[PDB]
């Protein structure tokens, strides 16, 4: 009991604002029970259980209301799981639910979740304040009212003029008390929870007493219709005062004299007056009867279904139905959902005290889920126990006029009906104070967060971290709810924002799990990404079922703040401008890429090309750029690399020429790529600073496309020829792919197009998925469109049949069967150059005239004295072919 | 006349499909008039002008219909401008409107515009086919029908069973004729346009004749209500056959005997029968009268407004209103808009013949705009001339039963009413043939385009480039329209897709102008980007006014194909996977950046940091990485660069260690950056391959943050010390900014946080916006939060007052006034080291104990013998300060 009372000395249900965020940057105990569960359980129980639940039980029945509760509950339990994965991730920063969402989903969604929830909570201030004024005018003080109806038809207008003149009278009282008396209202958090849960138990007490003996609450009927028990007290058409039968006051309101003359309406005279039991209790058979629907229309008299009546009097000449019971408004299914829904909102109060718990990764998930479960078990068992204990004709009655102006709920209370009427009053007064505290701290947090700059003046707090300007704005948005002055119309507008916040909380947690954003570790047990997606579609549907023409103005206001933060998100970090909106998406996509493996399933060539630029700078071989567009036509990353010699301190105007000749040239041949002009000491280094440092992030170059040294055996170019030899060993170590083009100047540019073409591919042993795919990418292009693919295979085994039967089943698996297959078969440098000249005879004698020849490029020797052991081997390999492309690679897979 | 008839030998209104796209890749005259204008003018005039316009004129009046036409017209004229900017851009490829949109907006939107337009046109096939069957059962052959009403109440059911049994009977006839007889229906394009425009002129002929003498079309009334003139011929209650007055057949349908006994309904007997003129003409005063609204309800008898009647008989005991004129359906404003809208669709037929025009950048814009203008001028002047010439009670009449079963339009025809009835029949038959040709060529184009892979089997054309499988699918989507069997319900579903296509065509052209996508040159005269945006919101609103619960199923089907193409767009080019969806957005954002200038308005430091990694590799100074997070905290690009020595062929396992030590370290201090580990010959080169080649695209590094050589005067490190000196001259030439950190090991890491801190800034002459902003970024961080900013200025002039009054007005402009200001003032190497030791005395004697000191770093000498002329100058400058950061930069501006 000791940790109870000491914890009850701590227990306050208020959010932790930015003053509690200051104590987190400068650097007690709680529990699961008084920390999350009891704050959340208070902020869900509200006015709708007491003031408008029984009105929904009788109208929609119990079979449609059970389906109605189970779809409004099931959104909250799924968006608690999306509040759970935010809790398990992160370190749960001290201060509010705003800082828990904003830090774990970035400032992108946090300014939009935090701002829908500001307006959604401010209308919960004005809705509860209309809840208190309605109780004050119907049950507590139904005498005191300024505006009174000047006729029998002014009940529509004078009632709404009551709700405007007391709301604005009390909203100024509510705003000042939370302003000056913050320390007092901090103390009464246990009073308000005591008033609620006793009032809920007082219902469940009296439902058990009514099973054994129901109370005395009779109702009076007149044919099928009932009548207001306001003016008269006794229900009889004739008062039998002994030997003198007297006209009652029931006679007086209908018949236009209190005399025995019988000069009145024919519907009163032909129909008798019946007084039966209005609350027959749990022993009664109501559940088989009161089950389906009673969807009335505004003006229709509420009529008991199963009574014998007399069918006449088509008009309604009863002094505007002076003594009867009516329907206030027309009603249907998808209107009540806007009224029921704010009874299930308050999950975000589950983490008002995250900076005081000790196990915040376990209290915040398990606490709200248990709080939703104990609340939905009340709601569902309230709906049935309202149905099977109370006659439906008073359940269709707002304001309890059929039971002589007492609360429809409060007549089911065992001690007294003044218990719930007072008990729901200090409840709804208290959740009005809480809503004028939880909302001004929130706008205080967003304003000091700097996340949206035009809301900057609302950060001006007072001396103790309490606001002064957000109160005056939240007093003027509660003000708009009070001018509407109608509990049934504030409720769908209020519901439209709390649906919108739970729309985003399910949205961002489903996206960031799928795309694998950085720093996203939902370490929760019972979680998936579809489970946030399923709740995302569900409270998309509820948002239109309320009112579709308000759901579009709710999205496109929230969808425009989400884009307004990003346009200010760019202009702070990325310098300025609409360029920064593209810089950030460039950065954020690259940081996404850092997790996955490179080799995953599939291979595509991503070209690194490197050109030679001479003196009076320009490219020497534009046909090499012309090849690049013929493979990777309007596709992945292209890096046009180039080098030149020495002293960047005075060589950069040459770099300006060198880059600009390439930029206008890629546009000339439709290459969408990126230029790198590097100034090195020798060309040996400057090529190797691009084979390993081209393309940051995941967008690495994957192949290297290079020409051929044509000035091979000449004066000094040997070391430039030696730079080619170090390039081959480099790509094997770095695990790239090499593409070597021979006779570069005679290549098909984009004017020349070929016809009757044949490409001849010689796939001997190695490089399967790259030597096969390279013509298939080329043929795909319009220049190489009208061409033929020929694949010739060298063999070294004995059988060729199964060798072809192994080869012919590759194409069926590759789905590119259109190539024709033909089999062929037959100190250290000479053995290399024995088979060189022999095979090159076999190459030409079946492929003298192709438009392009493909060959395997073998591995260079590790000796490094193999300049002449290996390169005459390749010039014999290029035995006077017109266009041959050499290829080798390492460590890849092609599907 | 010669180019007419020869052009009339060419004039065919069919789209150019993929066979016309083959003739563009292998590689006559037209004009504006027969090329764009007349094809577009045919495919807008349809069934709605003849069959359901007059029904809308009488119901919605002429004041609401004029506002109705002017908002459905104004969407088409704005989406023609968005079709104009697609035309002026590009080269206008041969073949259809699909290839014009797909190439100019990429395969992203082209598969979604091209697929909404496929379904939007297929229902235009089934709508027109219901238009022909309705004319065939009401005017031409109203005798032949299989299903006939078994009672007076079967007219609802038997009519819809007529439309199902003839539609599917004729849809098989429509599908085969376009299959086998493509050459025949190619010839009749001039017949169908001749049938339309003569029928439109036959209306405007007879409206002029009716002004001088209206024809004879009388109608019969009975009190306020009219009656069907079907069975009887003469309108009198008593046939006066001489001396024997006889009961008419008008008597026979009402009164239940053709005898003179008068045994019948009291509404017939108390009310007289009036036969007035049903079409009073242009001379009549109808326009002041027939103006407002007549929104009826299903079952209500159409009643003339201004007639004297007799008010009795509450029920309708007239053998289910056997002889009367009714309303087929309930109606309101936002239901008729779904019926009127397909009268204005057909813009995409403006470029069916783009591959045959000569000036395709001028014919396509000016042709469709003139085609919309001449069509809207018909529609608006048809609405008024229908109102002010025809009595409203037959305008509320479908099927023309009040005028004895003749067309409400066709009675305004001057030669004969059989002109329009035949003329609108060969029109609507012809636009049904055209819709079963324009739609199967379209799905043939998307299937061969490979843009969506599950639609691949629909590319199987026949031998002459004509489809065979897209016809059977478009016969089965017309089939669903025929089972609905109702012209009033196919029309909003048909309207929902053509609105969706014009939604995207306005969308993509407004986006790609704003973001400046590559290759987007709208060279059109009268164009802006808001003018596409204004039309985008307008046919967003029309899409909900039709039916909101169909607009959400129209977007989220089109919005899901747009994301399905991209997930196949990634898995083709970027290897595979959901990584490729991020690679493409990374590439596409960088290619956007290539246009704009760098220096635009604002400056932010984008750090290039470079570290020293020793033997048994690890970073030597982790405190330098600790500084990076304290400036650019969770913000722009960070490049952690590193070098090591020699022979990448065998040095890459050292590179694996070198990169991995940095990756776990940036996470340890919350740095979101990118690693580059470069292996060079000397460290002189390998630093300079990062100062100019770090960060492709727009995301360049903008500053360089570097430590300090502490082993200054020692054994061999002179040349490594000389590598620092070449780094300073390099950044001045490359126009970067330099940040030099002194005493690197004693820096505040993220555990240690400071209090009572002072940062002392010495801004002497140069580097304004960088030396001011650098503490302001630091203070912003939590470690440097509780600190003070002190700015001390060295002076060389005489006055200091106005010098402070120039300095104190900077802070008011910078809004960072919180710093305190204090003024101070007072072979070749010695003059540099005279003022060095003098100023460094002045530095320390006001700033002995700051947490960080900022100083201007001067320019190095061009002599290059200034190793000792300049670096003792800096070590005297660092006169035993704890933490000082040196800074200089070039060519920037800070706002
Ligand atoms: C209550 O009684 C009346 C007659 O006493 C029932 O009959 C209906 O009366 C209205 C007149 O307001 C008529 O329009 C309906 O056609 C009557 N319905 C019939 C004859 O079936 C009325 O239904 C009763 N109310 C109930 C059962 O809820
Ligand atoms: C046509 O005549 C009738 C009476 O002959 C007009 O009067 C209405 O009659 C209906 C009965 O179906 C009543 O429900 C309405 O209350 C009557 N309206 C009155 C009396 O104003 C009827 O308005 C006439 N139709 C017109 C003018 O369009
Ligand atoms: C109505 O009844 C009263 C009896 O209370 C009588 O005084 C009065 O005269 C009667 N009025 C008549 C019969 O008009
Ligand atoms: C009302 O009920 C009583 C039974 O006490 C009966 O005598 C009377 O006739 C009824 N009146 C009616 C049906 O109008
Ligand atoms: C109705 O009038 C006819 C005259 O055509 C007459 O033959 C018949 O007897 C009459 N029926 C009566 C009066 O019931
Ligand atoms: C119908 O009009 C005629 C005028 O020819 C008149 O004699 C007759 O009384 C009218 N009938 C009515 C108003 O029922």
Coordinates of N, CA and C and ligand atoms in Angstrom, one line a residue, chain B residues 223-225 267 271 302-314, ligand 2:
Chain B
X223 N -55.3 19.0 -67.6 CA -54.9 19.7 -66.4 C -53.4 20.2 -66.5
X224 N -52.7 20.0 -65.4 CA -51.3 20.3 -65.5 C -50.5 19.2 -66.2
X225 N -50.9 18.0 -66.2 CA -50.1 16.9 -66.7 C -50.4 16.7 -68.2
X267 N -60.4 12.4 -61.8 CA -59.4 13.4 -62.3 C -59.6 13.6 -63.8
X271 N -61.3 17.5 -65.1 CA -60.3 18.2 -65.8 C -60.6 18.1 -67.3
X302 N -44.8 14.4 -65.6 CA -44.2 15.7 -66.1 C -45.4 16.6 -66.2
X303 N -45.4 17.7 -65.4 CA -46.5 18.6 -65.5 C -46.2 20.0 -65.9
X304 N -46.8 20.5 -67.0 CA -46.7 21.9 -67.4 C -46.9 22.7 -66.2
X305 N -46.1 23.8 -66.1 CA -46.2 24.6 -64.9 C -47.4 25.5 -64.8
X306 N -47.7 26.2 -65.9 CA -48.6 27.3 -65.9 C -50.0 27.1 -66.3
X307 N -50.6 25.9 -66.0 CA -51.9 25.6 -66.4 C -52.9 25.5 -65.3
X308 N -54.2 25.8 -65.5 CA -55.2 25.7 -64.5 C -55.6 24.2 -64.3
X309 N -55.5 23.7 -63.1 CA -55.8 22.3 -62.8 C -56.9 22.2 -61.7
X310 N -57.2 21.0 -61.3 CA -58.1 20.7 -60.3 C -57.5 19.7 -59.3
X311 N -57.3 20.1 -58.1 CA -56.5 19.4 -57.1 C -57.1 18.3 -56.2
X312 N -57.3 17.1 -56.8 CA -57.8 16.0 -56.0 C -57.1 14.7 -56.3
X313 N -57.7 13.6 -55.8 CA -57.3 12.2 -56.2 C -55.8 11.9 -55.8
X314 N -55.6 11.8 -54.5 CA -54.3 11.7 -53.9 C -53.5 10.5 -54.4
Ligands
LIG2 C1 -50.9 20.8 -61.3 O1 -52.2 20.8 -60.6 C2 -52.2 20.4 -59.2 C3 -53.6 20.4 -58.7 O2 -54.5 20.3 -59.8 C4 -51.3 21.4 -58.4 O3 -51.5 21.2 -57.0 C5 -50.8 20.2 -56.3 O4 -51.4 18.9 -56.2 C6 -50.7 18.0 -55.5 C7 -51.4 16.7 -55.6 O5 -50.7 15.7 -56.4 C8 -50.5 18.4 -54.0 O6 -49.7 17.5 -53.3 C9 -49.9 19.8 -54.0 O7 -49.9 20.3 -52.6 C10 -50.6 20.8 -54.9 N1 -50.0 22.1 -54.9 C11 -50.6 23.3 -54.6 C12 -52.0 23.2 -54.1 O8 -50.0 24.3 -54.6 C13 -49.9 21.2 -59.0 O9 -49.0 22.1 -58.3 C14 -49.9 21.6 -60.5 N2 -48.5 21.3 -61.0 C15 -47.6 22.3 -61.3 C16 -48.1 23.7 -61.1 O10 -46.5 22.0 -61.8

